[PDB]
């Protein structure tokens, strides 16, 4: 009972071609770096094992002993070797990612599978190299960990190693040195390395776009960033076999639709359904019960969509897209309730039905997907922080099904599933050359193999925007097996060095240089042509889509048997400029890909593509302007409350900083019952001794004399925040903190302080990397970061406070771009250590209960609050609230408290307390008896 693989229904990549030529991988090693594997699973088999490289434990212990490796592990047949890089982990192994993506490059699923077709990778007759690294102490061990398994894997006898991690934003030149000479360890041994894209979208994550201000907003990080890797991005074919219901419409036929579902439907059993809108209210699922809830995608997460049908009753949940030609999406388990995604067309139909049935069905089927031909939404951008082109190439990453942990299967979706696939394309590709180009060494192969397969990748084409997609997004195209096998030439930049040709900074007229390269034994004519593209941008934001500029006439070049010829595509985009820089004020990318034909009306045969940006992209800033110069209040990752754009609360009592992220300096505020408590050596202050909090809020920012429940920015007649310490060890705003939201990658971070005199009174320790600001999620980066070491005492270098006066807080900071120029971003910092004078008697009116004081309060910085404080015990808990005074000067004061459980409790006199604080911090507070008692 031999059942078929998935790959004889579904080849978007035309593996089968390529495996008709160089085989299923029979004899050859191939090597995973992931997570973690379930090494016993039913896909790790080989056919034949007599034709395998290692056919016994004592096969590979020898292969051990002669490279000194002495750890890792004989598995199976098919499992040759395992180790764990990073065993002295106390986090437990996580065994999905892992199998999933080793499953794709050799799963070799026998048909004695529970599953309808077989999973067969793209090598499924090789032996695998399964090695685990994880982070857990630094990334610099991390690097370490997998360099290590780097140089294993090729000392093992590896011809391809598949990396499906990574570290967004990250750059290359911050890499170990084992790690970087791993990477040419492999490639000066023809090992291919093959690394994911990443997940992580552009600057802002999957669910924001990048202001059109900032042109550099890749994510591509480490290890994809390294020039010697093959980086996948991924995308979606027009059709991909998936799992179907199918319902009857109003003309009265059978139309069946795609689903992605998380858990389990009876299969082939009618279900009802009825329409209950975006989920978000109870009376939407009021006709739910028993039936499946119809809920639109909308302003809710899926887990509240989800959860709020189970709780009316019904049996399972259909969430159906608000994208117009979107991507299915996992929906998450919730109390193992059976959801399923469906495109929005599929949804539309299912809400206007008249027989409101759908029956789930069991055999999966090719099916015409919602996307088209789409890049997905979260495969990450280019460039690298250094500035280079990834990703190089794409792959389909769609809602895969591979293998996964306990013998099981699953579809997953990213950069990480369309690796394996271009991995095993690469490896089999290299053995074709073998017998192809025997005469080459194994790096020539190498070199060779990853130029035919970006060359021969096909450009995918916006059919929306009339467009090719960006090189910064899809590299040099989607790789095509078929046309890879096929290729006799393939195109290089001016240097020969890659399928990609990287221009750095150009103006509007710059031309592109490209070597066509003929391996056949006769010579060869082709039509090429360049097509010239940029950024499509929809108001302040980047569309994250390509808008096409024009393209150039087709003109042909004939090449010479085993040889080569060089083109020049003249480019001039200057009556764009005016447009572009309307859209794009610090410039805009003039991209494309010099396509390549044997005729002009048949399909392209290759393609290379050519990335220029016009302006100087070394020096665009690496920081976001600090949030007190917003016009209307907000930032890139912080949204303003429009009734009062000078709003600006703190920390308060939040345990992640998910808001307040933008550029500005932090401080603290430290109540007087605190200060009190801590100079009278309080132990436990918090809940016990004080209702107070010290709570962190930023520079500048004052608290109204009312209400303290929000704090307000204030600025000078110039405009510049009103920032203001006083540096006297009580914690009542003590420092400055700058805490940044970057834009680019910086290094060499450091603080200093100028005296407005033409002097540095103090520096701070240098911060030597940092990385953008690339999202704003727990899941990967804050939108915001806070640099201790720039934290400023109020000290110079000697270590004696600084005199009263103003003084330039200085940050400094480099872009990792070659050349760059240091940028730096100034703040006016005040500095005050005067105590307030304030009154040392008082006299109380019994009458009105009026408190007069012997004198008003004479501040050095302009008062910031002069109060009186009452501390009354709600449930034995020292309360404090505060008195405003009177316009006379005086204070009345009240003779009971209502407490939070609706009582009352009388104060005494001993209970109230005169406090005065100016702008830098310096406060004193005298209990209200003790002036009564100031007389002789
Ligand atoms: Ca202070
Ligand atoms: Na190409």
Known sequence: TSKATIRDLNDPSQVKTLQEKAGKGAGTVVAVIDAGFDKNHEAWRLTDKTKARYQSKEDLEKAKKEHGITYGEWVNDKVAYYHDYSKDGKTAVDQEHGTHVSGILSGNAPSETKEPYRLEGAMPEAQLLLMRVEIVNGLADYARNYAQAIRDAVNLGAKVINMSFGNAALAYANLPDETKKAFDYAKSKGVSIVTSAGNDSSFGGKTRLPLADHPDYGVVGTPAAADSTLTVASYSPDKQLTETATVKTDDHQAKEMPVLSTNRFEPNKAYDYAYANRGMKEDDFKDVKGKIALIERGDIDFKDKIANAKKAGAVGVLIYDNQDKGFPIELPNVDQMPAAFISRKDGLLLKDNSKKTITFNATPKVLPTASDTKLSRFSSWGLTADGNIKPDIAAPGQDILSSVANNKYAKLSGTAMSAPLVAGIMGLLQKQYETQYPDMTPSERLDLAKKVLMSSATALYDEDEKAYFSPRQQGAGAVDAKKASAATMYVTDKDNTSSKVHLNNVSDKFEVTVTVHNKSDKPQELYYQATVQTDK????????????????????????????????????????????????????????????????????????????????????????????????????????????????????????????????????????????????????????????????????????????????????????????????????????????????????????????????????????????????????????????????????????????????????????????????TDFDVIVDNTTPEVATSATFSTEDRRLTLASKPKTSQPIYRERIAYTYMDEDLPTTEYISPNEDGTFTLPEEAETMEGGTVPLKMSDFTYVVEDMAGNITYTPVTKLLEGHS
């Not at 390549?596 to 399909?603: I, T």
């Not at 920015?713 to 939201?741: C, E, L, M, W």
């Not at 640099?787 to 009263?804: A, L, P, Q, S, Y």
């Open 537 to 824: 941008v929809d108001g302040k934001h980047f569309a994250l889509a390509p808008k096409a500029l024009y393209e150039t006439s087709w003109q042909k070049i004939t090449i010479p048997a085993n040889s080569s010829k060089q083109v020049t595509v003249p480019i001039d985009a200057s009556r764009f400029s005016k447009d572009l820089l309307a859209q794009m004020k610090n410039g805009y990318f003039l991209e494309g890909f010099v396509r390549f034909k044997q005729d002009p009306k048949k399909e392209e045969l290759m393609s290379i593509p050519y990335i220029g940006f016009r302006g100087d992209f070394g020096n665009l800033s690496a920081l976001e302007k600090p949030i007190y110069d917003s016009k209307d209040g907000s930032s890139y990752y912080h949204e303003a409350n429009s009734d009062a754009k000078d709003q600006l609360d703190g920390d308060g009592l939040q345990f992640y900083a998910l808001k307040n992220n933008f550029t500005a300096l932090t401080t603290e505020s430290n109540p007087w019952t605190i200060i009190k408590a801590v100079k009278e050596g309080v132990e436990n202050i918090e809940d016990i001794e004080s209702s107070e909090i010290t709570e962190t809020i930023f520079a500048g920012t004052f608290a109204k004399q009312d209400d303290d429940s929000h704090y307000y920015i204030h600025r000078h007649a110039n405009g510049k925040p009103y920032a203001a310490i006083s540096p006297n060890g009580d914690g009542n705003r003590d420092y400055v903190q700058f805490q940044g939201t970057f834009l680019r990658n910086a290094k060499n971070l450091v603080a200093e302080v100028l005296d407005k005199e033409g002097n540095v009174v103090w520096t701070s320790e240098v911060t030597e990397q940092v990385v953008k600001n690339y999202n704003n999620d727990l899941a990967s980066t804050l939108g915001s970061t806070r640099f201790e070491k720039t934290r400023w005492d109020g000290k110079d270098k000697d270590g004696k406070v600084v005199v009263n006066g103003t003084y330039t807080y200085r940050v400094r900071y480099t872009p990792i771009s070659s050349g760059a120029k240091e940028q730096h």
